[PDB]
Amino acid sequence: AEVKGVCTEAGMYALRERRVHVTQEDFEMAVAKVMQKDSEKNMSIKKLWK
Amino acid sequence: GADREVQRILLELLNQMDGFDQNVNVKVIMATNRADTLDPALLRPGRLDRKIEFPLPDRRQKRLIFSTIT
Amino acid sequence: TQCRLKLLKLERIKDYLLMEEEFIRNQEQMKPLEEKQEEERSKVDDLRGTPMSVGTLEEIIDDNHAIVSTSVGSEHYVSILSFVDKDLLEPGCSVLLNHKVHAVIGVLMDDTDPLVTVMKVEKAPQETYADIGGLDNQIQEIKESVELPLTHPEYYEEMGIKPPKGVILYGPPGTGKTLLAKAVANQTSATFLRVVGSELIQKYLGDGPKLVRELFRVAEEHAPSIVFIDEIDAIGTKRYDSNSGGEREIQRTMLELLNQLDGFDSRGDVKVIMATNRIETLDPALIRPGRIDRKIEFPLPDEKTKKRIFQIHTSRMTLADDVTLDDLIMAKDDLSGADIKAICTEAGLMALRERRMKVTNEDFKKSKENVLYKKQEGTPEGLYL
Amino acid sequence: LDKQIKEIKEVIELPVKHPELFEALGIAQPKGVLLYGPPGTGKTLLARAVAHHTDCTFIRVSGSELVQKFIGEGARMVRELFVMAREHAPSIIFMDEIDSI
Amino acid sequence: MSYDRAITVFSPDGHLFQVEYAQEAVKKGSTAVGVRGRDIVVLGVEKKSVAKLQDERTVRKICALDDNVCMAFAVVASVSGLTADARIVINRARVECQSHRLTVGDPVTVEYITRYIASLKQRYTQSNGRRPFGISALIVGFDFDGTPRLYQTDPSGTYHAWKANAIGRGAKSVREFLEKNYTDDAIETDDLTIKLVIKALLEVVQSGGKNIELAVMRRDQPLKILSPEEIEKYVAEIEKEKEENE
Amino acid sequence: GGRRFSEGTSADREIQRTLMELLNQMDGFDTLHRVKMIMATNRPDTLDPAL
Amino acid sequence: QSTYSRQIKQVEDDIQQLLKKINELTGIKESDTGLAPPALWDLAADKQTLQSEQPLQVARCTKIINADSEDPKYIINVKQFAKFVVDLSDQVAPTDIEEGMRVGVDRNKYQIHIPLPPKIDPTVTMMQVEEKPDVTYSDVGGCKEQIEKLREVVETPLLHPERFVNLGIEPPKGVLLFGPPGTGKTLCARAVANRTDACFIPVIGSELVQKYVGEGARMVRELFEMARTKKACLIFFDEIDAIGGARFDDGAGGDNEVQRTMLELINQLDGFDPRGNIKVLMATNRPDTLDPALMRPGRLDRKIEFSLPDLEGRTHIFKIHARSMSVERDIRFELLARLCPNSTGAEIRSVCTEAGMFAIRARRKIATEKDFLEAVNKVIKSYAKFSATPRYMTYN
Amino acid sequence: PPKGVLMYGPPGTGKTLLARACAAQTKATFLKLAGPQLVQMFIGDGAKLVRDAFALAKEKAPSIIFIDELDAIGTKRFDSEKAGDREVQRTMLELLNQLDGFQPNTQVKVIAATNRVDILDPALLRSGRLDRKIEFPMPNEEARARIMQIHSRKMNVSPDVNYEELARCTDDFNGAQCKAVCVEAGMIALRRGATELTHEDYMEGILEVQAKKKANLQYYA
Amino acid sequence: MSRRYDSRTTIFSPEGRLYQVEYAMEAIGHAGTCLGILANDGVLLAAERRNIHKLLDEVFFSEKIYKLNEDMACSVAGITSDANVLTNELRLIAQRYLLQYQEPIPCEQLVTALCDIKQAYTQFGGKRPFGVSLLYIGWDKHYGFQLYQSDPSGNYGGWKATCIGNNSAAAVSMLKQDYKEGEMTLKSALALAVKVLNKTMDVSKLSAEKVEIATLTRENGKTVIRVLKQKEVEQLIKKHEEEEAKAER
Amino acid sequence: DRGVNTFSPEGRLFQVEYAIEGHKLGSTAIGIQTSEGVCLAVEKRITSPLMEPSSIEKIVEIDAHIGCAMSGLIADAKTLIDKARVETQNHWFTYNETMTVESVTQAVSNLALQFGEEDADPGAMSRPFGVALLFGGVDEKGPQLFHMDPSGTFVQCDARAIGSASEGAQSSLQEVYHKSTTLKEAIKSSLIILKQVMEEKLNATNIELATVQPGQNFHMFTKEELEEVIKDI
Incomplete structure (x- = not known):
C-alpha cells in the first residue's frame, strides 16, 4: 500500500511543479514523504487505516 | 420494517455509486468519525481509491487556528 | 409367505374397490352422490376464484373457526366453509383461502422455509467403519446407544428397558469424535442431522431455545434419526460478544434440550451425540444420566496401531513403499489420528507440486517437516517424563 | 514474494479449477485454508487476487448485517451460503478481520 | 496462609x-x-x-x-x-x-508407609485451600520378618496387599492374563518373578526394553534399578515362552 | 441522546437517526440565528460522543 | 405371478382415472370433507357469511365511545394499524366481548358480528400444551413418601373442593418442587394432573421470554388471564433456573428480559385482582436464583423437597422399573439397591439400561444378575463425577 | 398534596391488602398499572403508553394509581456504550414528565410498591416524585396474632392456640406465611376428622409447611 | 465473593492434567529456541539472544545464559520475568549444595528442589507457575556429563538432546535425525546446535547478536563454566554455514 | 452462587447432609454389644483371589482391648483412627490405666464438625468427614458399644449397623439382637443381615470377625474360628 503510495504522492508533486510527465524530481520528494507515513505506522503499533 | 428500509436504501446507493466510472462524475465523499457504528462493508475499497487521513494537530498547527477564531 | 401375499393384494383392492363402487353406481342411482358430488368440487373452484390469499394454520379451534394469519400482514378469523374439514388438517401447514369470504378451501401449500434446509446435512463419510485401524471394541460400545436400536429395536423393546438415547464423547481430542459421528451415520443409513453447537448461540436474543425446538421437530418426522451436536462445550465456555444474552441464554438453551429429550413432550427415536473435549466445563444437568445411557472415554490410538492405519492412507494418496514408513510414525509419540492424515495429504500435494503423480520418499519427508511447524508432533508428552 | 505464491496456488486454485486432478491422484479435497502472518503481507489482496485467477466469485462475509439478508444475520447461516455457492460455482468464501472493528 | 478457596x-x-x-x-x-x-x-x-x-x-x-x-x-x-x-x-x-528406622529399630515395613500415604492424601483434603495428589503407588518392601511384600495404594488412601496386581490401561485385563502366570513355581524362582513383571507389561502394548524400566529389591539389600540392556534380553525370552505354552 | 450501540435491539436503532439529524441542523451547514435551542438532560453521559 | 402383476398395474391405473374423486372424497385440497361432521359445521358458518362476518379481519377493542352515529359505538384498531369506528350487531349474538380483547370485524362493512374467543392473543402459547395425558405409575418411580406429599396439595382440592369449604379453610394453590434433577419433578407433575383429572398446561420458562422487552409481558399476562377464565387450570411453570433470576441490570441488555416474565406473573397474581381460578406449580433446581416475591406464600403455600430419595426408596424404584421390563424376578431388587446408594431416579433407570447393553452384546433376550452387578459398580464409581446433584443440592 | 408516596421493604407485609384499604377510605378509583405493561413489544409506542395511562387518570376523576413492580420501567445509571434497550429509557423519562407540574400531581397520586429501593435509581425516588418513604418491616409478634385473628374467623379454632406463642419461638415468618400456616394446619385437621383446628394441628402445621427430606431424630438433638 | 473470583484453575481435571501447567506449556513454545546437546569431552548450550539493537550496554554476562553455580550453567525458553526471580533462587540452591557436598551438583538434584515450589503453585494457592522451562547443563562425578530439563510443575527428564521453545518439534526431530544418543564430540556438537538455531530462527545466516552459545567443559579434573564471547561464536557460525553450502550440491 | 456453609430453610447445613450420605456409600459393619463381650463383624467383599485377604482390614484397633469397625470412605476414617492411637497410650501415661470406650469417642467427635470453607485455619477442616465409626470393646466398666456419627452425635448402643444397609440393618438388629441373645448368637444374627448388601454368600474369606471379651484382650479370629460360625448360619 506504501509502495503504491510513492506513485500516487508523485502525481501531487507533478501538478505542483506544473509538469505533464512525472519527472525524477517528483519521485525524490515522494520517497521521503512516504517514509514519514511508514514511520507513523511503526510508532502507533497499529495500522493507519481505520 | 424500519431496519429493512435503511438496508435497501444503502444497497441502491452502492449500485448507483458504481455507475459513476463511465462518466466524468466524482464519487461520494463521506466522513467516518466513529467506525464502529458503521459497516466494514462500507469501508471496503474498489469504489474507494483515495483514503484521507486526519490526525490530531500538533502545537504549531493548533496555534494558527486559535488566531483565526479570536 | 403365500397368506401374506394374498392379504396385501386384498388390502390394496378394498381401498380402491369400495371408493369406486359407491360413486359410479350412485351416478346411475337417482338420489344419492350422483351429480352433486362431482359438482361440489367444481363449486370450490368457482367460489375461490383467482387470486387466492395464502395463510398458515397456527391452530384449529373447535367452535367452527381456526386462526389462520393471512398474507396481508393482518390476522383473520376463518370459518370452516367452502367444504372443508377442521380435524383433517394438521398444525403448521400452509393453507389456501378464498379471498372473497375467508374460508379454507384446502391444504396443499407449505411454501418452504430455508431454516429446515440448513439443518438437514446428509452423510457421506471420508473414512468409516471398517477402514479405521485398531481399537475395534471402542466403536462397538458406541453402537449400543446409536446404532443398535436402529438396526434392531427388537432386542431393546423385548428386554423392556428405556431405549438408549444420548452419548458423551469425551477424552483429550485426537481420536475422531467427528469421524465416529459420520461413520455411525453411514452404517445405520438413517437420517443425519448436523447442527454445530455454536450455531445455537446467535446474534439474536432469545432465539436459541426456539432453534432447539425446531431441530427436534425436524428429527421426529425424519426418525429413526441421529443428531450430532458437534462440540457442546463451545457455548458454555465462550462469550462471543455478538449477543447480550450472556450466561442466561446458554442456560435457557441447555434447558430446552432437556425438555425436548424426555421432558413433558418426548421426541420419538432421536439419539444425541455430544462431542466434547471436556466434561467439567459443561452444565451439570446436561451430562446427568438418563439423558445419556452410555459414557465412554477415548484414549489416544497406540503407536503400533498408527502403522496399520498408515498403509491405507498411503495407498489412498498413491501407494509407494519406498517411503521410510517407520521413521514418520516414530518421532510422533501417541497423538492424533489427524497427524497421519496431515502427513499423507501434504505429501501428495508436494508430489504434484514437483510435477508427478507418484508420491515418493522425499515427498513424505518434506511433508512431515511442514507438519512439525503446524502441530508439535508429539514433543509435548516427551518433555514431562 | 516468490515463496508465497507456490503454496497458495496448490491449495486453493487447483481443486476449484479441477477437483478431477485431485481425485485421480487420490488427495482429499481441502477443507480449511488458514492464513496467518504479520499485518502488511498482502494477505487480504492475495485472497481477492486468487478469486480473479481461478475465475471464481469472491463472497466476503464481513460481519455486517447490511450485507446479510439471507437470514438477516450470519452465525447460523452455514449451509444456505454453501447451497448458493454451489449454484454460482466455484466460489471462495472469505472471513476477514481488519483488526479495527 | 491467605488462600483458603475451595478446591475440594x-x-x-x-x-x-x-x-x-x-x-x-x-x-x-x-x-x-x-x-x-x-x-x-x-x-x-x-x-x-x-x-x-x-x-x-x-x-x-x-x-x-x-x-x-x-x-x-x-x-x-x-x-x-x-x-x-x-x-x-x-x-x-x-x-x-x-x-x-531411627526411632524404631525394626526396619520400616510397607504397612507403615501405606498408612502414611492414606494420611498424606487426607491431610491435604482437610486443610483449607489444598488438593490431593493424583498418584497411585505400588509400595514394595521388606518388614522386620524379611518377608517380601507388595502393597498397592489408591488416590483416596486405602491400601491392600496383593500377590500380583496390574494397574493402567485396563487394570483388570492385564491382571486376568497375569493371573494364569501366577503359579507356585513362578513365585518360588526369583528369576521367574522378574519375567512375570515384564510379561504383564507386554500385554497392553508389546516390545520395547527401553520403555520398560523395572527395579528389583532382594532381602533388606538396597534398590537395584536394572539396565535397559537387561530388559531387551528379557522381553525376547518372554515372547518365545508365550509361543511355548500356547 | 444516543451511544455507539451496534449490538442492540430495534429500540437502540431509531434513536441514532434522530440524533444524526440534530447535528446537521445545529452546525452542519444549517444554523440558528436569534432563535435559540435548549436541551434538557439528567446525564450528559448518556449523550453521543459527537453530540 | 401373472394375476398379481395384472392387479398392480390395474389398481394404480384406476387411481389416475379416480383423481377427480380422490380430491373431493379424501381431501388433500378441494373439499377436505367426509360430510358426517362437516355438513353440520359448514351449515352454521353459512348464515354468518351471507350478512357481515366473513371476511373477518382480527381486530381488538381499544375503547368504548358513544360518539358519532348510534349510542353503541366502539373504536376497534385492526391488525393493519388503522382505526375504525364500528357498530355492534345483534344479527348473530356477541358472546366474548371485553375491552382490550380481540374482537372480529368485517372488511365489507366494519361491525362486530362475533368476538374472537377469550385471550387467544398468544396463539403461540396454546398450541404446544398437552391436555392431561395418562402416564402410568409403572414408570413414575417408587412408591415413596415423597410422591404422596405432593398429591395432598395438588390433587385433593381440585378433585374435591367440598371439604375445604365445609371446614372454612382456603384451598391449596401453591407447591414448590425443588431438589436436583433426575428426581422426576416433571415426571410426577404429569402423572398426578391426569389422576386428578383437571386441565394440564405445561409451559417452558424459556418460551415466556422472547426477543423484545415487554413482548414477554404480553405472553405471561394473557396466559394467566386465559387460565383463570377456563374451568380448573393448573399451570405447571417448567424448569426456571436462570429464566427466573433476581432483578438486576448490566447496561448492555441486563436481566431485563428475564425479570419481565417474572414481574408480569407477580402483577396479575397479587394485583388489585387476586389469583383467579389458577393453581400454580413451580419447578426450580435453584431457589438461590429466585426473587423474594415468588418465595413467600399466596402462590407457594407449602414448600416440599422432591429430591434424592432415601435408602428404602431406592429399592422401590427398582421394583417399579422391573414391572415395565420383562427381565427375571429371580434378580434381587434389594441387592441392586444396596450396591448403588446415593443414586437419583435417572441413574437407577440407566442401571437397567446398561444391564441390557451387556445383554444384547452377549445375544440374550433377557438380562442377567451378572450384567446387573456390573452395572451398579460402574455407576457408583464413574457416574458420580458427572452427576448434577452436588451443585444443584447446594442451591436447594 | 403528594405527587406519590412510596412503599418499599420485604414482600409479604400486606402491601396489596393495604392498597385495597386505601381505595375504600378515599372513595376514588385505584387505576391498576403494571410496570411491565408500560414497556411493550412495539417500539416508541411503549413511551406513548406511559403518557396515556397517567393522562386517563385525570379524565376518570381524581385518581390513585396503583403501580406494581416499578423496577420494570428502568433504572437510570446509563452510560451504556453498547445497547442498553432504551424502550425502557423512554418510558423512565416520560414517567417523570407526568409527575412534573406541566400536568397536575395534586390530581394524580401514586401509591407505589416496589420490593427494594436498592434496585431503584434516585431520579425516581426524590422527594417531589415520591414524597413519603414508608418502610415496611416484617410483622411484629403481636401483628402475626392479629393476622391469625382474622384468619381464625374464616375456619374454626381453639382458644388454646394463638400466633403470639409461635411468634415468640422463632421469628422466621411473614404475613403471607401466617396465612399459609393456618391453611396448612387445617389440612391435617380435616384429614383426622375435626370441625376445628386445635393446638396439635397448628403445632404440626408450622413443621409441615417448611420442607424436610430425611428429618431428624438423632441427626441433631 | 473470593471463590467466585477464583476460576478454579487449581482443580484437577478427570483426564489427569493441571490446567495451569498446560497453559504454561504454551508460554514456553511462544518463546525462543533453547537446545542442549551432549558431547563426550564437554557439553554445550545454544540459546537465542533476543536483545539486538546497535545501542546495547551488556550489563549482564547474557540475559539468557546464566551461570547458576561455578560448575553449572543454564539457558532459557519462556518469559524473561519468571526467569529473573527463578535464576536467583537457582543460584542459592546450587551454591548451598556446593558448600555441603563440595562436588558438582547433579543436573537431576538441581531440577528437583525447584519442583516442589512449582507444584505447590499449581495444585493450590492460585499462584501462577513459572513461565520458563530450563535446560541445565553440567558434569557431575557420578554419571559424567548430563543435561536435564525442567517443566512448569517441575516434571523432569534426563535428555541427551532436547529442545523447547519456538519450532520445538522441528529442532528436536532434525537433531534426532542426524545425531542419536551421543555420537559426536564437543567440536561438532557446537556446529549442530547453531545449525538447528539457524533453521528455527527467522535470520538464516545469524550473527553473534542473534545467537549466544555457552559451553561447560571439564578441564584438569574441574568443571569450567564459560559463556563464549561473540568472536568465538562467529567461527562456529561459519563452520555450520559452510556445511549447509555443500549439502545443496 | 450460594455457599455450602449456609443453613438451609429445612434447618440443617449442606456439608453435613452430604457427609451422612458418604457413610451410606461404603461397606457395612455390625457392632453388637453382648454382656459376654463385644463382637465386630465386617464384610471383606473381595472380587479377586490375587488379593491377600488378611491385609484387607476394616477393623483397626483404637486400644489393646477396644476394636473399631468403620464405614463409608475407608481412607477418611483412617485419619481419625491415627489420632485415636496416640490418645489411648497417652491416657496410660497420665491416668496410669487404659482408656475407656466413652472417653475416646467423645474426644474424636469434637473434631468431626469444625468446618469453615473460607477464612478458617489450615490446621482445621474445610469439610467434615463422611465416616461413621463403631467403637466396640469391653473396658474397666464392662462391655460397652458406642456409636459415632459424622454429625458428631455420639450415643451408646447395644447393636448398631452402619454402611449401605445402615437403616435396614439397624431395624433388623433391634429385632433379633436383644440382651437375651448370647455372644455367639450375635455373630449368627450379623451374618444373615450382612448378605443383602454383599454380592455373594458368606464365607470365612468374606467376613473378618474380632471379639473382645472380659478378662482377655482383643483377639482377631483365626480361619478356624471364622469357619465354625460359617457352618451354621
Whole structure:
C-alpha cells in the first residue's frame, strides 16, 4: 500500500511543479514523504487505516 | 420494517455509486468519525481509491487556528 | 409367505374397490352422490376464484373457526366453509383461502422455509467403519446407544428397558469424535442431522431455545434419526460478544434440550451425540444420566496401531513403499489420528507440486517437516517424563 | 514474494479449477485454508487476487448485517451460503478481520 | 496462609472429587505392574517414552524411598508424567522412612508407609485451600520378618496387599492374563518373578526394553534399578515362552 | 441522546437517526440565528460522543 | 405371478382415472370433507357469511365511545394499524366481548358480528400444551413418601373442593418442587394432573421470554388471564433456573428480559385482582436464583423437597422399573439397591439400561444378575463425577 | 398534596391488602398499572403508553394509581456504550414528565410498591416524585396474632392456640406465611376428622409447611 | 465473593492434567529456541539472544545464559520475568549444595528442589507457575556429563538432546535425525546446535547478536563454566554455514 | 452462587447432609454389644483371589482391648483412627490405666464438625468427614458399644449397623439382637443381615470377625474360628 503510495504522492508533486510527465524530481520528494507515513505506522503499533 | 428500509436504501446507493466510472462524475465523499457504528462493508475499497487521513494537530498547527477564531 | 401375499393384494383392492363402487353406481342411482358430488368440487373452484390469499394454520379451534394469519400482514378469523374439514388438517401447514369470504378451501401449500434446509446435512463419510485401524471394541460400545436400536429395536423393546438415547464423547481430542459421528451415520443409513453447537448461540436474543425446538421437530418426522451436536462445550465456555444474552441464554438453551429429550413432550427415536473435549466445563444437568445411557472415554490410538492405519492412507494418496514408513510414525509419540492424515495429504500435494503423480520418499519427508511447524508432533508428552 | 505464491496456488486454485486432478491422484479435497502472518503481507489482496485467477466469485462475509439478508444475520447461516455457492460455482468464501472493528 | 478457596468440598455422592478424578487417570493409562515373590519383589513401569534420543541411566520413575522400601507410580494425562506430583510424595516419604528406622529399630515395613500415604492424601483434603495428589503407588518392601511384600495404594488412601496386581490401561485385563502366570513355581524362582513383571507389561502394548524400566529389591539389600540392556534380553525370552505354552 | 450501540435491539436503532439529524441542523451547514435551542438532560453521559 | 402383476398395474391405473374423486372424497385440497361432521359445521358458518362476518379481519377493542352515529359505538384498531369506528350487531349474538380483547370485524362493512374467543392473543402459547395425558405409575418411580406429599396439595382440592369449604379453610394453590434433577419433578407433575383429572398446561420458562422487552409481558399476562377464565387450570411453570433470576441490570441488555416474565406473573397474581381460578406449580433446581416475591406464600403455600430419595426408596424404584421390563424376578431388587446408594431416579433407570447393553452384546433376550452387578459398580464409581446433584443440592 | 408516596421493604407485609384499604377510605378509583405493561413489544409506542395511562387518570376523576413492580420501567445509571434497550429509557423519562407540574400531581397520586429501593435509581425516588418513604418491616409478634385473628374467623379454632406463642419461638415468618400456616394446619385437621383446628394441628402445621427430606431424630438433638 | 473470583484453575481435571501447567506449556513454545546437546569431552548450550539493537550496554554476562553455580550453567525458553526471580533462587540452591557436598551438583538434584515450589503453585494457592522451562547443563562425578530439563510443575527428564521453545518439534526431530544418543564430540556438537538455531530462527545466516552459545567443559579434573564471547561464536557460525553450502550440491 | 456453609430453610447445613450420605456409600459393619463381650463383624467383599485377604482390614484397633469397625470412605476414617492411637497410650501415661470406650469417642467427635470453607485455619477442616465409626470393646466398666456419627452425635448402643444397609440393618438388629441373645448368637444374627448388601454368600474369606471379651484382650479370629460360625448360619 506504501509502495503504491510513492506513485500516487508523485502525481501531487507533478501538478505542483506544473509538469505533464512525472519527472525524477517528483519521485525524490515522494520517497521521503512516504517514509514519514511508514514511520507513523511503526510508532502507533497499529495500522493507519481505520 | 424500519431496519429493512435503511438496508435497501444503502444497497441502491452502492449500485448507483458504481455507475459513476463511465462518466466524468466524482464519487461520494463521506466522513467516518466513529467506525464502529458503521459497516466494514462500507469501508471496503474498489469504489474507494483515495483514503484521507486526519490526525490530531500538533502545537504549531493548533496555534494558527486559535488566531483565526479570536 | 403365500397368506401374506394374498392379504396385501386384498388390502390394496378394498381401498380402491369400495371408493369406486359407491360413486359410479350412485351416478346411475337417482338420489344419492350422483351429480352433486362431482359438482361440489367444481363449486370450490368457482367460489375461490383467482387470486387466492395464502395463510398458515397456527391452530384449529373447535367452535367452527381456526386462526389462520393471512398474507396481508393482518390476522383473520376463518370459518370452516367452502367444504372443508377442521380435524383433517394438521398444525403448521400452509393453507389456501378464498379471498372473497375467508374460508379454507384446502391444504396443499407449505411454501418452504430455508431454516429446515440448513439443518438437514446428509452423510457421506471420508473414512468409516471398517477402514479405521485398531481399537475395534471402542466403536462397538458406541453402537449400543446409536446404532443398535436402529438396526434392531427388537432386542431393546423385548428386554423392556428405556431405549438408549444420548452419548458423551469425551477424552483429550485426537481420536475422531467427528469421524465416529459420520461413520455411525453411514452404517445405520438413517437420517443425519448436523447442527454445530455454536450455531445455537446467535446474534439474536432469545432465539436459541426456539432453534432447539425446531431441530427436534425436524428429527421426529425424519426418525429413526441421529443428531450430532458437534462440540457442546463451545457455548458454555465462550462469550462471543455478538449477543447480550450472556450466561442466561446458554442456560435457557441447555434447558430446552432437556425438555425436548424426555421432558413433558418426548421426541420419538432421536439419539444425541455430544462431542466434547471436556466434561467439567459443561452444565451439570446436561451430562446427568438418563439423558445419556452410555459414557465412554477415548484414549489416544497406540503407536503400533498408527502403522496399520498408515498403509491405507498411503495407498489412498498413491501407494509407494519406498517411503521410510517407520521413521514418520516414530518421532510422533501417541497423538492424533489427524497427524497421519496431515502427513499423507501434504505429501501428495508436494508430489504434484514437483510435477508427478507418484508420491515418493522425499515427498513424505518434506511433508512431515511442514507438519512439525503446524502441530508439535508429539514433543509435548516427551518433555514431562 | 516468490515463496508465497507456490503454496497458495496448490491449495486453493487447483481443486476449484479441477477437483478431477485431485481425485485421480487420490488427495482429499481441502477443507480449511488458514492464513496467518504479520499485518502488511498482502494477505487480504492475495485472497481477492486468487478469486480473479481461478475465475471464481469472491463472497466476503464481513460481519455486517447490511450485507446479510439471507437470514438477516450470519452465525447460523452455514449451509444456505454453501447451497448458493454451489449454484454460482466455484466460489471462495472469505472471513476477514481488519483488526479495527 | 491467605488462600483458603475451595478446591475440594464434599459431594452427596459420598465421595471427594479429586480422588475420583485421579482414579480415572490411572484407568486411562501408565501401566505399572507388580508381583511379589518369595525372596524378591519386583515392580515395573512401562513408559519413560524413550524415543531413541533420551537418557535412560539418570531418569527415575521408580524411586527408592528407602533401601528396603521402593515405590513405582502412575497417573497420566496429556501432561503425561506427573513426576512432579509424585516427587513430593517421594521426598516426604523418604525422610519418614529413614525417620521411622531411627526411632524404631525394626526396619520400616510397607504397612507403615501405606498408612502414611492414606494420611498424606487426607491431610491435604482437610486443610483449607489444598488438593490431593493424583498418584497411585505400588509400595514394595521388606518388614522386620524379611518377608517380601507388595502393597498397592489408591488416590483416596486405602491400601491392600496383593500377590500380583496390574494397574493402567485396563487394570483388570492385564491382571486376568497375569493371573494364569501366577503359579507356585513362578513365585518360588526369583528369576521367574522378574519375567512375570515384564510379561504383564507386554500385554497392553508389546516390545520395547527401553520403555520398560523395572527395579528389583532382594532381602533388606538396597534398590537395584536394572539396565535397559537387561530388559531387551528379557522381553525376547518372554515372547518365545508365550509361543511355548500356547 | 444516543451511544455507539451496534449490538442492540430495534429500540437502540431509531434513536441514532434522530440524533444524526440534530447535528446537521445545529452546525452542519444549517444554523440558528436569534432563535435559540435548549436541551434538557439528567446525564450528559448518556449523550453521543459527537453530540 | 401373472394375476398379481395384472392387479398392480390395474389398481394404480384406476387411481389416475379416480383423481377427480380422490380430491373431493379424501381431501388433500378441494373439499377436505367426509360430510358426517362437516355438513353440520359448514351449515352454521353459512348464515354468518351471507350478512357481515366473513371476511373477518382480527381486530381488538381499544375503547368504548358513544360518539358519532348510534349510542353503541366502539373504536376497534385492526391488525393493519388503522382505526375504525364500528357498530355492534345483534344479527348473530356477541358472546366474548371485553375491552382490550380481540374482537372480529368485517372488511365489507366494519361491525362486530362475533368476538374472537377469550385471550387467544398468544396463539403461540396454546398450541404446544398437552391436555392431561395418562402416564402410568409403572414408570413414575417408587412408591415413596415423597410422591404422596405432593398429591395432598395438588390433587385433593381440585378433585374435591367440598371439604375445604365445609371446614372454612382456603384451598391449596401453591407447591414448590425443588431438589436436583433426575428426581422426576416433571415426571410426577404429569402423572398426578391426569389422576386428578383437571386441565394440564405445561409451559417452558424459556418460551415466556422472547426477543423484545415487554413482548414477554404480553405472553405471561394473557396466559394467566386465559387460565383463570377456563374451568380448573393448573399451570405447571417448567424448569426456571436462570429464566427466573433476581432483578438486576448490566447496561448492555441486563436481566431485563428475564425479570419481565417474572414481574408480569407477580402483577396479575397479587394485583388489585387476586389469583383467579389458577393453581400454580413451580419447578426450580435453584431457589438461590429466585426473587423474594415468588418465595413467600399466596402462590407457594407449602414448600416440599422432591429430591434424592432415601435408602428404602431406592429399592422401590427398582421394583417399579422391573414391572415395565420383562427381565427375571429371580434378580434381587434389594441387592441392586444396596450396591448403588446415593443414586437419583435417572441413574437407577440407566442401571437397567446398561444391564441390557451387556445383554444384547452377549445375544440374550433377557438380562442377567451378572450384567446387573456390573452395572451398579460402574455407576457408583464413574457416574458420580458427572452427576448434577452436588451443585444443584447446594442451591436447594 | 403528594405527587406519590412510596412503599418499599420485604414482600409479604400486606402491601396489596393495604392498597385495597386505601381505595375504600378515599372513595376514588385505584387505576391498576403494571410496570411491565408500560414497556411493550412495539417500539416508541411503549413511551406513548406511559403518557396515556397517567393522562386517563385525570379524565376518570381524581385518581390513585396503583403501580406494581416499578423496577420494570428502568433504572437510570446509563452510560451504556453498547445497547442498553432504551424502550425502557423512554418510558423512565416520560414517567417523570407526568409527575412534573406541566400536568397536575395534586390530581394524580401514586401509591407505589416496589420490593427494594436498592434496585431503584434516585431520579425516581426524590422527594417531589415520591414524597413519603414508608418502610415496611416484617410483622411484629403481636401483628402475626392479629393476622391469625382474622384468619381464625374464616375456619374454626381453639382458644388454646394463638400466633403470639409461635411468634415468640422463632421469628422466621411473614404475613403471607401466617396465612399459609393456618391453611396448612387445617389440612391435617380435616384429614383426622375435626370441625376445628386445635393446638396439635397448628403445632404440626408450622413443621409441615417448611420442607424436610430425611428429618431428624438423632441427626441433631 | 473470593471463590467466585477464583476460576478454579487449581482443580484437577478427570483426564489427569493441571490446567495451569498446560497453559504454561504454551508460554514456553511462544518463546525462543533453547537446545542442549551432549558431547563426550564437554557439553554445550545454544540459546537465542533476543536483545539486538546497535545501542546495547551488556550489563549482564547474557540475559539468557546464566551461570547458576561455578560448575553449572543454564539457558532459557519462556518469559524473561519468571526467569529473573527463578535464576536467583537457582543460584542459592546450587551454591548451598556446593558448600555441603563440595562436588558438582547433579543436573537431576538441581531440577528437583525447584519442583516442589512449582507444584505447590499449581495444585493450590492460585499462584501462577513459572513461565520458563530450563535446560541445565553440567558434569557431575557420578554419571559424567548430563543435561536435564525442567517443566512448569517441575516434571523432569534426563535428555541427551532436547529442545523447547519456538519450532520445538522441528529442532528436536532434525537433531534426532542426524545425531542419536551421543555420537559426536564437543567440536561438532557446537556446529549442530547453531545449525538447528539457524533453521528455527527467522535470520538464516545469524550473527553473534542473534545467537549466544555457552559451553561447560571439564578441564584438569574441574568443571569450567564459560559463556563464549561473540568472536568465538562467529567461527562456529561459519563452520555450520559452510556445511549447509555443500549439502545443496 | 450460594455457599455450602449456609443453613438451609429445612434447618440443617449442606456439608453435613452430604457427609451422612458418604457413610451410606461404603461397606457395612455390625457392632453388637453382648454382656459376654463385644463382637465386630465386617464384610471383606473381595472380587479377586490375587488379593491377600488378611491385609484387607476394616477393623483397626483404637486400644489393646477396644476394636473399631468403620464405614463409608475407608481412607477418611483412617485419619481419625491415627489420632485415636496416640490418645489411648497417652491416657496410660497420665491416668496410669487404659482408656475407656466413652472417653475416646467423645474426644474424636469434637473434631468431626469444625468446618469453615473460607477464612478458617489450615490446621482445621474445610469439610467434615463422611465416616461413621463403631467403637466396640469391653473396658474397666464392662462391655460397652458406642456409636459415632459424622454429625458428631455420639450415643451408646447395644447393636448398631452402619454402611449401605445402615437403616435396614439397624431395624433388623433391634429385632433379633436383644440382651437375651448370647455372644455367639450375635455373630449368627450379623451374618444373615450382612448378605443383602454383599454380592455373594458368606464365607470365612468374606467376613473378618474380632471379639473382645472380659478378662482377655482383643483377639482377631483365626480361619478356624471364622469357619465354625460359617457352618451354621
